[model samples]
Target chain A: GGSVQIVYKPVDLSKVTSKCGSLGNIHHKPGGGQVEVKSEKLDFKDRVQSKIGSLDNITHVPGGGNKKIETHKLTF
Target chain B: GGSVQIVYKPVDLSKVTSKCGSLGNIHHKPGGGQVEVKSEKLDFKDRVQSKIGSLDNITHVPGGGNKKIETHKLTF
Candidate 1:
């Protein structure tokens, strides 16, 4: 069974862009305001996952400060 | 801007299997013997990457003795 799990926190949609070349689907969790993506591309997954890392709400960076986000849980 | 890179060694294909639900393409590089995956699913990437980790030829395992395999580099 091939599966990938990711734990992600929500972030600004306007700043973060899609890099998966329009592949797969993104689902959202209402209560926690989290987003879930179901796709077959690992590169895309990495892209999103990396973005989440870069968009960490805690760490302070130029143009990045205390943003709301989620940690993605991935299982493969 | 979204890309996933991995450095893997060769392993046995027969012993290792696919976990991802057929969503990406695999390409092989000659000479050094390496594999590359281009997909949009992180789950699949993790699956393959995990297999490569498990299928390490040097570690030594029953029913898994130094099998020929390839490391994959993935780009989204």
Candidate 2:
């Protein structure tokens, strides 16, 4: 057998807050939203949800496959 | 042999800022301190640094060992 280890690294609770922070939550979809700038604002949700895609399930299967990896985001 | 995969997920840059933000950097270590409250303040650094410890390298070397893991932290 190879090696399969699980460890919980310390993470600041604020990390969670940051992921779900106030700035990210401000859903301002003005009816008369203007040019490219307004379009930019609209992207905020996807931007946030987009982040989840990367930070979601991470796995390292044993047996000469994916093993372990380092991360800097919130630890769940 | 099994299967291995790698993918990049979108994430907000603000995630980085949150890691080392204003609240954490407010180093206020006064002299002649009293009570555990001051001691609590000093722990902020450790709290921050401590997070790194858990988010270090992850490996999965299979011959029949550790395989996959799901993480919510920032990907490297």
Which candidate has the highest TM-score of all? 1
Worst 10 residues of 2 chain B by lDDT: B18-27
Candidate 2 per-residue C-alpha lDDT over A6-42 given as tens digits, one digit per residue, 9 for 90 to 100: 3434543222222111121222221221211112122
Model 2: per-residue Cα lDDT over B7-76, one tens digit each: 3353432222221111211112212211111121222221132121011223332233333333465332
Model 1: CA > 4 A from native: A1-32, A44-49, A52-55, A58-76, B1-76
Each model's lDDT comes to 0.26, 0.26
lDDT of 2 at B55: 18
- List, in order, the clash count of every candidate structure: 31, 21
lDDT of 1 by residue, A47-67 (tens): 232321011112111221122
lDDT of 1 by residue, B1-76 (tens): 3433333332332332212211232222212123233346445233232322011112111221122223333232
DockQ of 2: 0.05
Per-candidate TM vs. native? 0.14, 0.13
